[PDB]
């Protein structure tokens, strides 16, 4: 399914922003575990967790290949010079 409601996008974002180092760009199992983790957030369902994780993956690689709008990745370091 190609439906991506707002909730998925906003949640996947806040999650990537608040938690990068613990993750990888193309994985789906590590990202799924990170989402399932309690500190990061809470997902009542399973299908929701899977969808959010997938969107997290696609955002993460879209970022790692190149900086992405709306993402507070903490990248001033390389440009604050």
């Amino acid at each position: 399914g190609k439906v991506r409601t707002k909730t998925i996008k906003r949640a996947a974002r806040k999650i990537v922003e608040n938690n990068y180092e613990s993750l990888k760009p193309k994985d789906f199992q590590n990202n799924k575990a990170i989402c399932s983790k309690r500190n990061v957030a809470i997902i009542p369902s399973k299908r929701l967790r899977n969808k959010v994780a997938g969107y997290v993956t696609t955002l993460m690689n879209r970022v790692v290949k190149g900086p992405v709008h709306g993402i507070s990745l903490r990248l001033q370091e390389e440009e604050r010079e």
Binding site: T7, A11, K14, I15, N18, N39, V40, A41, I42, I43, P44, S45, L48, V52
Partner: protein, 209 residues
């Protein structure tokens, strides 16, 4: 390997008591309206019957010296062919009345039969609900309010969900009929509380930083 005609005894013995439950509910709703009757539940015991009622203030129905309640117990012995004294009735009380639609709708009917204006009564009910803690409440009145032509007007405040399986839990609806001079006046209510019993609605996401 087994005979299906025996377990049918147990199955038909669990259907009979369910029907017994509902008749009681109707009887109560038609009698104990002054006690704010909400609902009834029954624990069929092999020894006797124990019935757990839900009233806003049991002391009323409880009766001085428990006379009224004891009168009631004997009565239900006749209809259900049960021996009296085995039909013990226990009362229970409700605290967050604003969380329950039935009590509020009974109050609304009481007000309306006084010729109290509809708007004031409905909004009193609504601020009551939001004071008790509520994310929404909707009210309705259909009938011959003023003229021969009949139209319906609805009041409300906050959001109310009307779709899905969640509507079978967090959404409590209730209705009544009012017999007035011009004709039947129909009123219905619904309250939405997403935080009952610590159950989380889906499509809800919390994130920590």
């Amino acid at each position: 390997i087994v005979r299906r005609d025996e377990e049918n005894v147990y199955y038909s013995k669990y259907l009979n008591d369910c029907i017994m439950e509902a008749e009681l509910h109707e009887f109560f709703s038609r009698e104990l309206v002054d006690a704010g009757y909400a609902s009834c539940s029954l624990c069929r015991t092999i020894d006797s019957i124990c019935v757990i009622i839900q009233c806003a203030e049991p002391e009323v129905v409880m009766g001085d010296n428990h006379y009224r309640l004891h009168k009631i117990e004997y009565l239900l012995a006749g209809r259900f062919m049960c021996d009296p004294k085995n039909f013990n009735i226990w009362v229970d009380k409700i605290i967050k009345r604003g969380l329950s639609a039935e009590i509020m709708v009974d109050n609304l009917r009481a007000k309306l039969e006084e010729a109290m204006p509809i708007r004031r009564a409905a909004y009193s009910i609504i601020r009551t609900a939001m004071r008790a803690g509520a994310a929404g409440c909707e009210v309705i009145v259909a009938g011959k309010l003023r003229a021969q032509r009949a139209r319906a007007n609805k009041f409300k405040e906050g959001c109310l969900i009307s779709t899905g399986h969640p509507k079978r839990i967090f959404l409590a609806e209730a209705t009544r009929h009012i017999k007035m001079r011009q004709g039947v006046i129909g009123v219905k209510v619904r309250i939405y509380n997403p935080n009952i019993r610590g159950a989380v609605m889906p499509d809800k996401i919390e994130i920590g930083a």
